[PDB]
Subunit: 205 residues, 5 copies
């Protein structure tokens, strides 16, 4: 404890908080979705509810440290409020996302942070045909709300959504699940914008 | 970072916060609506639910800075809580507006601020006839809650609501969408009041 | 700004906050309701939902100032949290009142404060007969929760609820609307208690 | 004001806050329920909703003062957050209790505190037979969550729930209402546990 | 009071807060569930709602003290926010858990902490067959969200869920209830992970 205590102090009570990435000192955030359950489908409003864990990873130089200087410590857990976090946000949400897990992250000595909040999201999806065999396909983009590609770059470890822990007895069965980096430009603005497209095709059982 | 850190400090930890506009030092706020989806229509209470991003823009002298004095920085992102924000509010709301995006804004060196919160709003709208061909028209005014035209002036960049990102498979189809600056006077009080009238005409599909 | 900044400082960062009225130094609060919409009527629980703006006004000596000493400033806007506010409360509420507008008030140099929160309230009302022609009448009292008439006096500017901005296409039509000061003494304790009775008679359309 | 200002200061900004009762320095809390309305009855989950004011009273030595030393002041109102409050809690609740009134209490010079929050509570009650003439009887216990009888003693002023302000036109009619101090003593642990049993028998109209 | 005041001070205002367990200084948390009621079953989404108290217990060296040095005090109550608490979390939750009791814990002189929050949880459960005689079985794992077995060890006092205070007239009858420590390993990581499996088999009445 005494060691971790000093480390946490030296990391957080030292200089002002990290002000977030900038065009000059850009930052790369790695997304990974784990889909747990498609809970509800509302064919009268075309809202659909997912429960997924969203895995976020970035690295700050300002969070590095030598384990030899701090009792052979390689990593600690700490509150997501003790540190800067990427404003990764869903675009087609129709209700404020509900948080299902603790707001705690894992800072590692190389300066990498892993943060995996579990969430229940309601997004725009027309579930027409979900009762058929070929099913229905719906999608939702995730990305930063205020940062462009110049400041925050998004990257996936993989195309395949982690379905390993998908509710075995869900009302709905997953036919495919996809996380795909996309790069848009708007006319107005010369700067790149990055999202990850979450695309699940599903049906009743 | 070190540079942006100093800048943010010098801007925010220096003098007391901006006390808001006054008759003497007025301020101009620029509204733009982007309608994403008409989610729900409740014909038993005449509530209707929109999901839109609301683009706000104003310029404070107290937020200006020379990029040469701060490492060629032209703009940063920061929390909407670090700065003053206009009390732009919906008049015919029937439920507390739900916030869908992060509370983060973009301050630029000329002292301009861009802030674009995504919202789900429930307002008064009699949807009678939404199931016809000529559809139904409904409207809601947005403006300041406590500031008159003497203190806060509203302005639109355009008449046309941005429908470019309107949910392709919404239950409802947009026939027209309109943002219009309006100026209400009274005999009772010398002061102008300013609102932007959001007027969407829509139907089922 | 620089002026208003000083004023706000001298008013708020000077002495401790106003501790609220007392029998010795009483205070008079002026209520005015503006009924916007009767949104919902639940005949199975006898809950009814109103959306109104509630206009509150009081005067504190501790908020007076000479405009000549502060750059000809006559009034500013500021957060309802920067100042003391009357605990004016609904008695027959059945659900926590939802706030629809910003918590911002208007302090004027004579020491008067105007604060107009928009609210959605659910109160006890048996709507039996709302579908008839003579309609149904329901009521709800507003008053202080902890202060008696010795400490806080209530007063109305008028008997007539401001219906000027009542939703033209509401499901329900207002037949009459009434705000009335009432004084009820208790069998134990000599102090008067004061409420304003809100009494609307309404029907379907 | 100036007097009440000093008093409040000397009471609250002087020593650290009251740490709560202990076996050595026990405290006695007096409960009183006033039932306003039985709003809703859900026969599919056996949840029932009450709206009641819950009157709490205790006396702290640390809150005493001589009115002569503070401008003849006998009592003030202040925020429930400025002081310690008993963790009186409902045992069979099925949803987080909703608060309907301000969090303001009344401290009196003898050191007594009166606090009367209005609440909407959902508790476990099988309403089977509520549609009959003999009606149905349901109950819910209130007590401290973490303090035993050794630390907090509960007491009633009376057996009879205050029905004086029960909604005249509620969907449900009160046949009897009861607040009863009960003492569960366990052999396992030599300390008493105290609750007040709220027992209302009611029917449709 | 004066004594408990000093103790609380010396414990909390002395050194920085406990930084949480680490591989080097591990910590053991003891889970116990007390099932009060199965409130609701939604066969259209396979959500099921439980109301249970969750008993948590751990021991910190940093919380030890000698009663002789602090007025023979053996234990006090204090806010869960004054101290570190384990991030024990439900895995198959589908909605943010609602808290039903106060956030207050009991610290004892040996450094042990007891904390028993009451909760309403919604988890994934296919209730198909709940209307039969043999009933239906459903389960939900509880464990740390960010800590592995290297840092936080979970332990049960028993296999048997405390059904002693289960709602006598619930819509659903408990056939069996089970809390079982489980140890998983993963591919990604060398470390072990610990959960407690809550397994209740139930039916209608």
């Amino acid at each position: 404890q005494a060691n971790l205590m000093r480390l946490k102090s030296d990391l957080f009570n030292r200089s002002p908080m990290y002000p977030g990435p900038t065009k000059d000192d850009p930052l790369t955030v790695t997304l990974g979705f784990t889909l747990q359950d498609i809970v509800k489908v509302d064919s009268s409003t075309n809202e659909v509810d997912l429960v997924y864990c969203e895995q976020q990873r970035w690295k700050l130089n300002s969070l590095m440290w030598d384990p030899n200087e701090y009792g052979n410590i390689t990593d600690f857990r700490t509150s997501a409020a003790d540190i800067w976090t990427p404003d990764i946000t869903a675009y087609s949400s129709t209700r404020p996302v509900q948080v299902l897990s603790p707001q705690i992250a894992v800072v590692t000595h190389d300066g990498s942070v892993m943060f995996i909040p579990a969430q229940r999201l309601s997004f725009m999806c027309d579930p027409t045909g979900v009762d058929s065999e070929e099913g229905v396909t719906c999608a939702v983009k995730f990305g930063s709300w205020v940062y462009s590609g110049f400041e925050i770059d998004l990257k996936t470890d993989t195309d395949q959504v982690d379905l390993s822990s998908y509710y075995a007895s869900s009302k709905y069965e997953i036919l495919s699940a996809t996380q795909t980096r996309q790069v848009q430009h708007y006319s107005c603005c010369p700067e790149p914008y990055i999202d990850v497209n979450l695309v699940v095709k599903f049906r009743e059982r």
